[PDB]
Design a protein around this ligand. Structure first.
Ligand code: NA
Ligand code: NA
Length: 437
């Protein structure tokens, strides 16, 4: 007698809808009914209940295989794989080429109607519906007539009433021949005239946004500092954060005193800089930052010298590391700088941006970030989708947090290497105020 065989066209994926249910596919049975058992290749499939089974063999030509999925609440497809063990021989059954194991690809489809929730950096409010701007899908750099339909895909428009900060690079907004010839002129601290450029200053724009937030959150402590501290004469003008909303692009140099301090006085580096360096430079004295600029603000050195720094730097290489870091930062009322890393084209990529909040699916996966991107033109926060390298259910030792770039309508090999965070420093401020009673 001939030995029975099974066949399956492996190019056909099995794609259950997002709803929970017991789904099925068919396996062709040749020359009888082979005694086999189906198995998932992973034992860490929390979204599948049990093993696959042969639920019908009544048709001589095919078996029905059943498997049970939980609802896919996430906005991502998720993958599982079924192989087949010959129960008489104990070997995995071969596929069409006689060498590879017969493998059926399962892809449960994404949730088309997710319920999303949001966490914003403390103290910046939250977008109103009128402040959320939907985005057109681009193709070959041209906007199509289609829009991104996921509910978290919106720009957060800056208005007179919004409370985030997004200082933009003058060197990116500038249009030669159309902007004012004095566009880059800064009136320095001794009323001296300075042409400050900022093409490589994403670290300093990110620091400036975070510092604007910090001056605002701590404004009552800073008022007490101005009243009670022995302020060095030359630094007195710097105890001030002005961020003037509603300006035209051609007036960006008149928008932010903090960003202008970096643009006038910070020394240049084409290899960029570090968010944490600019933050330290503005707030307290460290020898490492002695050569950052031609001045050293160090405006609250006697609050933070010899105490906890409110600045931290952490890295993340897995989904778990990224979400714990984001949640810890958001839940502890801190501001967020992101240092992106990867490739933009056939060239290395590094860039600092500011994060003002995150979107979450019903499983509390982080699915989108709201980014102040000093390279991008609009006076808005841009959504950057979150994508993770491989299986999020069976995480590998490295599963970086890649960015989907809705403004360019494309994934990019750009991932989040880590966060630089800025804490209010409430305990340090309290100890300073208690010592100045
Ligand atoms: Na399972
Ligand atoms: Na750049």
């Amino acid at each position: 007698k001939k030995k029975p065989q099974i066949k399956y066209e492996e190019k056909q994926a099995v794609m259950p809808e997002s709803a929970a249910g017991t789904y099925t596919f068919e396996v062709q049975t040749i020359d009888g009914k082979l005694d086999y058992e189906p198995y998932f290749t992973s034992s860490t499939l929390p979204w599948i209940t049990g093993a696959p089974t042969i639920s019908s063999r009544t048709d001589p030509n095919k078996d029905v295989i059943s498997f049970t999925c939980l609802k896919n609440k996430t906005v991502w497809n998720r993958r599982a794989y079924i192989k087949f063990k010959d129960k008489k021989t104990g070997q995995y059954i071969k596929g069409a080429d006689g060498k590879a194991d017969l493998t059926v690809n399962i892809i449960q489809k994404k949730n088309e109607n997710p319920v999303v929730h949001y966490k914003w950096v403390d103290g910046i409010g939250a977008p109103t519906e009128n402040q959320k701007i939907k985005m057109k899908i681009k193709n070959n750099g041209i906007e199509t007539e289609d829009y991104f339909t996921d509910p978290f895909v919106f720009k957060w428009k800056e208005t007179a009433d919004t409370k985030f900060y997004n200082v933009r690079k003058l060197d990116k907004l500038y249009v030669q021949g159309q902007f004012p010839s004095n566009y880059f002129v800064i009136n320095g601290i001794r009323n001296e005239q300075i042409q400050g450029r900022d093409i490589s200053q994403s670290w300093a724009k990110t620091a400036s946004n975070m510092l604007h937030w910090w001056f605002e959150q701590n404004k009552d402590y800073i008022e007490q500092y101005k009243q009670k501290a022995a302020i060095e004469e030359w630094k007195r003008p710097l105890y001030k954060h002005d961020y003037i909303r509603g300006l035209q692009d051609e007036d960006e140099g008149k928008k932010s005193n903090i960003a202008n301090i970096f643009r006038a006085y910070s020394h240049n580096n084409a290899r960029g800089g570090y968010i944490e360096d600019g933050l330290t430079w503005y707030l307290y004295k460290r020898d490492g930052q002695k050569n950052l600029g031609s001045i050293y603000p160090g405006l609250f050195n006697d609050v933070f010298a010899h105490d906890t720094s409110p600045i931290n730097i952490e890295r993340c290489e897995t989904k778990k590391e990224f979400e714990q870091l984001m949640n810890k930062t958001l839940d502890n009322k801190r501001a967020i700088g992101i240092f992106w890393q990867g490739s933009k084209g056939n060239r290395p990529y590094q860039h600092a941006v500011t994060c003002w909040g995150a979107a979450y699916d019903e499983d509390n996966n982080i699915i989108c970030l709201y980014i102040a991107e000093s390279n991008l033109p609009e006076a808005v926060l841009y959504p950057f989708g979150v994508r993770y390298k491989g299986n999020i259910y069976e995480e590998a030792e490295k599963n970086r947090t890649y960015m989907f770039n809705y403004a360019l309508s494309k994934p990019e090999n750009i991932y989040i290497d880590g966060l630089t965070t800025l804490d209010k420093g409430e305990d340090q401020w309290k100890k300073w105020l208690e010592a100045h009673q």
